[PDB]
Design a protein around this ligand. Structure first.
Ligand SMILES: CCCCCCCCCCCCCCCCCC(=O)OC[C@H](COP(=O)([O-])OCC(O)COP(=O)([O-])OC[C@@H](COC(=O)CCCCCCCCCCCCCCCCC)OC(=O)CCCCCCCCCCCCCCCCC)OC(=O)CCCCCCCCCCCCCCCCC
Ligand SMILES: CCCCCCCCCCCCCCCCCC(=O)OC[C@H](COP(=O)([O-])OCC(O)COP(=O)([O-])OC[C@@H](COC(=O)CCCCCCCCCCCCCCCCC)OC(=O)CCCCCCCCCCCCCCCCC)OC(=O)CCCCCCCCCCCCCCCCC
Ligand SMILES: CCCCCCCCCCCCCCCCC[C@@H](O)O[C@H](CO[C@H](O)CCCCCCCCCCCCCCC)COP(=O)(O)OCC[N+](C)(C)C
Ligand SMILES: CCCCCCCCCCCCCCCCC[C@@H](O)O[C@H](CO[C@H](O)CCCCCCCCCCCCCCC)COP(=O)(O)OCC[N+](C)(C)C
Ligand SMILES: CCCCCCCC/C=C\CCCCCCCC(=O)O[C@H](COC(=O)CCCCCCC/C=C/CCCCCCCC)COP(=O)(O)OCCN
Ligand SMILES: CCCCCCCCCCCC(=O)SCCNC(=O)CCNC(=O)[C@H](O)C(C)(C)COP(=O)(O)O
Lengths: 459, 70, 88, 56, 107, 178
């Protein structure tokens, strides 16, 4: 596993010893090279795992997440190259340092043989994101957004540390392999109920679960483009990965414990999809769509069936890619208009046809058009929920219809109609933005050819 | 009829240039890959299943069929 | 489409044709610049029917605010040419 | 021109050096987990005439 | 009220700068044309040519460590053996009952 | 469309508008031309009976029962011209309308084509640049104090002057650019 970790660490001295005008090129090239190295991890076995050492292992649940994390950094650098043009060299190097540190923390988090190491890195990811949000943010609400993002996560995750140390004191180990092999049932007790809650709430708050999702719109709207990309693509999947890893010790308590969260997610997907219909901000709409998708992923994880797990993994990967692309498109519009309002810039297909094509493809992928992996995960989770109960189909269908509705609403409002007359500073789209969209979209359509790579360990 | 008018439209130069560049690089690496795959398939690959001879233990890469996988 | 590019001469000829087909106004008296209320003694209702006849002749309809202040054939032709972007 | 472009292009070598060092460290850490080499009940095998270890 | 109505000495808000004006064929990477062009070239090459193609081909030709055709052959030989010997295909018990010691109830 | 609106509509304008609407909907009801001519002449005869009435109260009481009668028999699917705000081709060609400032972003390789057109465009730009500076002062001196009372603009009064706020009315894309 160190063959990935060490180059990521060496990215820092390379960045800090680079020329004043060669930081972006070197960072992008070496990040792309690191990503190529990460591709080797995908080869996975039907047996236990890829146990490299006592500290790190790899699995077909961790491998796609690691590949996505390594692939995201060059895209974030490409997106950040634009708005940081008038920045001093030291501060640009600091921004790149923050991105590299976040990648390193995520990479070490996804392998994490031992649960306290997982918690330590899962919390270490909180600092670079906070600095990025509250330092390189445009508006004055970035401070409040960062406070919300920090305190929701910490309030959720502080009981998890107590639960983990108690579990290690009782069982004797927190290594995931021993935990899996020596698992024992949980008796229906008040202490066990509260232990279940302490183990579950930390990952629930970062999904975000409906009713605990308030931090996400603030953090996503106030963050710079790279921060929004990473938050929507990788940081949301940490909760799902943690739940998938930790639900092994929560049985058979999960059968009845899951109901409050299942009801919340099933109604909250409808609520957030309906919220998306009446939104005046692109970023807020994309954030609420992310909330709906992650609520459906929560339902999948709570059902706890093989089809549920495969669908949840596929949907996590697909949502990460799609949300990153949508945020990038919104940022391209914003850097021209400086408004971040849907109704201001209209009829952009006439002025920017290729960017309109990118918008259409991104909206179709968010709409879960077959045979995209978005629909693969959606359909697997829907089938698993139907097997759980035949009445879920109503809510799932309502969510699908509303999702298509607001996706095409967002496409039509910005791309179709008549152009705004008084806006005359809409320059042709640069090659950088087009390449960013292409590198977002092509991996999705290549992955739909090999869906087994993102279906997780239960394939 | 000499009634040819001017068509006002946005600049298609940058879009076309990006498309040409992307196609150029994609083909630049994909054509050699396709040629190599074709040559390997026609000349070398597609091993056939056999029984392990007694007293012989095969290496790990001898359990696969396609030469590139091996 | 295959629509011939109508010119100012065609518009004026068609307007005068439809006006000469209007029995209320004598053909000899009317002139491109001939006013409606004073030079030919027509009512306002006659003016609105003239506007409707123009509308049926040219296949497009004029808003009421613009139509109510179209008082000569010359300015009717000018309005139609401006609306349809006629060169010569 | 050598000895001048090196002062500006020396940085490029660092990520690659890190990769080979990480591979070496992975093999070195692997060397410490040989307690069951050729002792698993599934892959318990008799050594070849010129074999000392089943895997490295 | 002789106050200047100025809260503080502040620079005026600068106007956004067009990359195309001073340099057509700008590629949107950098204001310096040479660094810009080389950034475009390295991004396009190392992404599309290297990763998106070579890594995709590598993933396509990954060897079967998940052991799918192995399972196919095992199932084929087992079904051949069982159909021929009259055994009823798959068995309901995964483990032989002879080796499980159930606890006597005596209720 | 082109003419600036007034603060209100007088009785005479409202009567004309009702007459036009009633004639249009009667034509929609009466498809054939001879029947439409007959019923339109009868409509005109019924319409001009109260032409010579004098007092305001009875005139206002009329046109009101007329509007109610119109609404009762308004032919819920009237004929509409294709380019009208309700026609089948109202905004068909609005996606082909590109602004004029888009030509300022063309690549020099693209501007190499059509050199005469761009020379003429530069001449138009110079003319606009001078005319705007004249127009600002002209409108400042001509406007009544306290702000305009109507959205009607004055014409040019000098020799070299151009009508104020002319650039975006003269340079409309076209009705059917493509
Ligand atoms: C159907 C088979 C096709 C075989 C041919 C191969 C085609 C290769 C396409 C590769 C992927 C496309 C990349 C996306 C960005 C496009 C790049 C671009 O800008 O084009 C500029 C280029 C130059 O035009 P231009 O004038 O310079 O630009 C002006 C504007 O851009 C204006 O441009 P525009 O107005 O022409 O619009 C751009 C165009 C292109 O933009 C797109 O939207 C295309 C992407 C659509 C997919 C959206 C996601 C939904 C999930 C699909 C995932 C499956 C992918 C399969 C594997 C893909 C491998 C990469 O959009 C559309 O035409 C509408 C798309 C709606 C199609 C809905 C049907 C989708 C499901 C069909 C099932 C597919 C599998 C069949 C399975 C059963 C049978 C075996 O135009 C093109 O070349 C168009 C691309 C070809 C159309 C693709 C339509 C279907 C192909 C989908 C993927 C291949 C399926 C494999 C099965 C083969 C058998
Ligand atoms: C956006 C784009 C992004 C791109 C990203 C990069 C790509 C990433 C993915 C790369 C993955 C490549 C891969 O996995 O290859 C798959 C696979 C690789 O083959 P394999 O599984 O390793 O080999 C199978 C056996 O082990 C061995 O089979 P074999 O040895 O029997 O076969 C013989 C051999 C050679 O076969 C032959 O030479 C003969 C075969 C035809 C003979 C027909 C008769 C001709 C003779 C008669 C006429 C002349 C003589 C007579 C003249 C006189 C006549 C009177 O086969 C080949 O050489 C196939 C070549 C395929 C090349 C694929 C290269 C992939 C490059 C990836 C990047 C591509 C970038 C784009 C640019 C690519 C270049 C354009 O290739 C194919 O799947 C071929 C597909 C064929 C489809 C047939 C039609 C199906 C239609 C069904 C649906 C219809 C309704 C709808
Ligand atoms: C705000 C936005 C959303 C945030 C997240 C919300 C999710 C948290 C909800 C927690 C899930 C449920 C908690 C406990 C569930 C156990 C089932 C129990 O409650 O039901 C009955 C329990 O009966 C009564 O409910 C007793 C508890 C009454 C006191 C609880 C307060 C009720 C409302 C509090 C909600 C406040 C939530 C927010 C806190 C800030 C069953 O009767 P009994 O067979 O006897 O007990 C079985 C359990 N045994 C076997 C261990 C004994
Ligand atoms: C633009 C106008 C058209 C021009 C193009 C015309 C040509 C059309 C061709 C385009 C699509 C048509 C469909 C043809 C499909 C044939 C290829 C297919 O067969 O290969 C697939 C193989 O594709 C790959 O498996 C999937 C691509 C890998 C995706 C990884 C993404 C690359 C890394 C980038 C970063 C990752 C970001 C996301 C994180 C997870 C499936 O093969 P498979 O049947 O299975 O077995 C392979 C052969 N074996 C048996 C020898 C093993
Ligand atoms: C987004 C904000 C969410 C914040 C988290 C909300 C839930 C927090 C979880 C409960 C807090 C305590 C976690 C328990 C730590 C694990 C240890 C454990 O499970 O052992 C239990 C300990 O159980 C407890 O002591 C629990 C006591 C609870 C005190 C703290 C109350 C905090 C608030 C509780 C109500 C809210 C919980 C749900 C919140 C919903 C979301 C807002 C048994 O202890 P023993 O004595 O050793 O064994 C018994 C046999 N002798
Ligand atoms: C199929 C649809 C159903 C049909 C129902 C519609 C019912 C309509 C019948 C109502 C009849 C009336 O006019 S209601 C009577 C209302 N009062 C007056 O008409 C008083 C003065 N009239 C005017 O001023 C006019 O403008 C005039 C002099 C005509 C023109 O003047 P010009 O000199 O400026 O052209």
């Amino acid at each position: 596993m160190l063959k990935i970790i060490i180059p990521t660490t060496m990215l820092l001295p390379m960045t800090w010893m680079s020329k004043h005008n060669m930081i972006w090129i070197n960072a992008t090239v070496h990040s792309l090279l690191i990503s190529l190295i990460s591709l080797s991890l995908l080869n996975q076995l039907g047996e236990n795992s890829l146990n490299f050492s006592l500290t790190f292992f790899s699995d077909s649940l961790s491998a796609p997440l690691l590949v996505l994390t390594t692939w995201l950094l060059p895209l974030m650098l490409m997106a950040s190259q634009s708005h940081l043009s008038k920045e001093t060299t030291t501060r640009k190097k600091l921004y790149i340092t923050m991105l590299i540190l976040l990648q390193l923390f995520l990479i070490m988090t996804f392998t994490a043989t031992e649960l306290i190491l997982f918690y330590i890195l899962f919390e270490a990811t909180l600092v670079p994101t906070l600095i990025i949000i509250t330092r390189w943010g445009n508006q004055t609400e970035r401070l409040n957004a960062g406070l919300y993002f920090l305190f929701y996560t910490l309030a959720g995750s502080l009981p998890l540390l107590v639960a983990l140390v108690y579990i290690q004191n009782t069982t004797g180990s927190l290594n995931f392999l021993i935990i899996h092999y020596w698992s024992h049932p949980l008796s229906n007790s008040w202490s066990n109920i509260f232990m279940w809650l302490a183990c579950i709430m930390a990952f629930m708050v970062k999904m975000p679960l409906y009713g605990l999702h308030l931090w996400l719109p603030k953090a996503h709207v106030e963050a710079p483009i790279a921060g929004s990309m990473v938050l929507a693509a990788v940081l949301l999947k940490l909760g799902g990965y943690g739940m998938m890893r930790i639900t092994t010790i929560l049985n058979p308590l999960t059968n009845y414990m899951a109901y409050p969260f299942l009801m919340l997610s099933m109604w909250g997907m409808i609520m957030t999809s309906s919220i998306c219909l009446r939104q005046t901000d692109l970023k807020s709409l994309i954030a609420y769509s992310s909330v709906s998708h992650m609520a459906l992923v929560i339902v999948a994880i709570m059902i706890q069936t093989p089809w549920s797990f495969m669908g949840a993994t596929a949907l996590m990967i697909a949502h990460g890619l799609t949300s990153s692309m949508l945020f990038c498109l919104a940022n391209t519009n914003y850097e021209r208009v400086h408004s971040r309002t849907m109704i201001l810039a209209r009829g952009l297909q006439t002025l920017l046809p290729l960017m309109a094509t990118w918008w259409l493809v991104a909206s179709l992928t968010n709409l879960a058009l077959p045979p995209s992996i978005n629909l693969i995960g959606e359909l697997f989770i829907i089938t698993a929920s139907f097997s759980w109960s035949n009445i879920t189909i109503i809510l799932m269908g309502m969510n699908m219809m509303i999702t298509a509705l607001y996706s095409l609403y967002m496409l039509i409002t910005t791309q179709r109609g008549k152009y705004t007359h008084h806006i005359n500073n809409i320059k042709p789209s640069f090659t950088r933005e087009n390449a960013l969209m292409a590198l977002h979209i092509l991996p999705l359509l290549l992955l739909t050819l090999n869906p087994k790579m993102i279906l997780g360990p239960l394939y | 009829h000499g009634k040819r008018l001017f068509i006002i439209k946005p600049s298609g130069f940058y879009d076309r240039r990006f498309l040409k560049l992307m196609r150029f690089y994609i083909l630049l690496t994909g054509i050699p890959v396709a040629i190599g795959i074709t040559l390997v398939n026609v000349f070398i690959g597609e091993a056939e299943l056999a029984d392990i001879p007694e007293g012989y233990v095969p290496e790990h890469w001898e359990y696969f069929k396609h030469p590139i996988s091996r | 489409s295959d629509a011939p590019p109508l010119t100012l001469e065609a518009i004026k000829d068609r307007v005068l044709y439809v006006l000469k087909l209007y029995d209320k106004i004598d053909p000899e008296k009317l002139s491109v610049n001939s006013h409606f209320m004073k030079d030919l003694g027509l009512d306002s209702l006659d003016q609105v029917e003239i506007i409707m006849a123009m509308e049926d002749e040219f296949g497009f309809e004029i808003p009421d605010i613009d139509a109510e202040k179209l008082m000569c054939p010359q300015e009717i032709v000018d309005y139609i040419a401006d609306k349809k972007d006629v060169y010569e | 021109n050598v000895l001048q472009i090196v002062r500006d292009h020396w940085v490029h070598i660092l990520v690659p050096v890190g990769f080979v060092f990480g591979c070496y460290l992975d093999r070195r850490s692997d060397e410490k987990l040989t307690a069951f080499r050729n002792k698993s009940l599934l892959f318990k095998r008799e050594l070849r005439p010129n074999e000392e270890v089943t895997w490295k | 009220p002789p106050e200047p109505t100025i809260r503080l000495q502040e620079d005026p808000d600068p106007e956004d700068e067009n990359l195309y004006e001073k340099n057509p064929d700008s590629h949107g990477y950098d204001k310096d044309p040479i660094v810009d062009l080389w950034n475009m070239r390295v991004v396009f090459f190392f992404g599309f040519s290297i990763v998106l193609v070579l890594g995709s081909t590598f993933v396509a030709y990954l060897p079967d460590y998940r052991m799918q055709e192995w399972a196919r052959r095992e199932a084929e030989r087992l079904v051949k053996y069982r159909e021929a010997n009259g055994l009823p295909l798959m068995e309901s018990n995964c483990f032989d009952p002879n080796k499980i010691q159930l606890p006597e109830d005596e209720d | 469309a082109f003419s600036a609106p007034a603060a209100y509509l007088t009785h005479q304008q409202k009567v004309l508008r009702l007459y036009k609407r009633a004639l249009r909907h009667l034509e929609s009801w009466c498809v054939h031309r001879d029947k439409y001519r007959y019923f339109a002449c009868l409509m005109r005869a019924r319409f001009d009976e109260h032409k010579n009435e004098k007092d305001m109260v009875k005139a206002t009481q009329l046109l009101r029962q007329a509007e109610e009668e119109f609404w009762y028999g308004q032919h819920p699917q009237p004929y509409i011209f294709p380019e009208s705000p309700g026609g089948t081709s109202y905004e068909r060609y609005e996606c082909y309308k590109v602004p004029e400032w888009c030509l300022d972003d063309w690549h020099p390789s693209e501007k190499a084509m059509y050199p005469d057109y761009f020379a003429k465009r530069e001449q138009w730009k110079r003319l606009r640049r001078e005319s705007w500076e004249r127009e600002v002062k002209q409108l400042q001196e001509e406007t009544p104090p306290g702000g305009p009372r109507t959205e009607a603009l004055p014409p040019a009064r000098k020799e070299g002057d151009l009508p104020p706020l002319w650039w975006h009315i003269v340079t409309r894309p076209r009705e059917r650019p493509m």
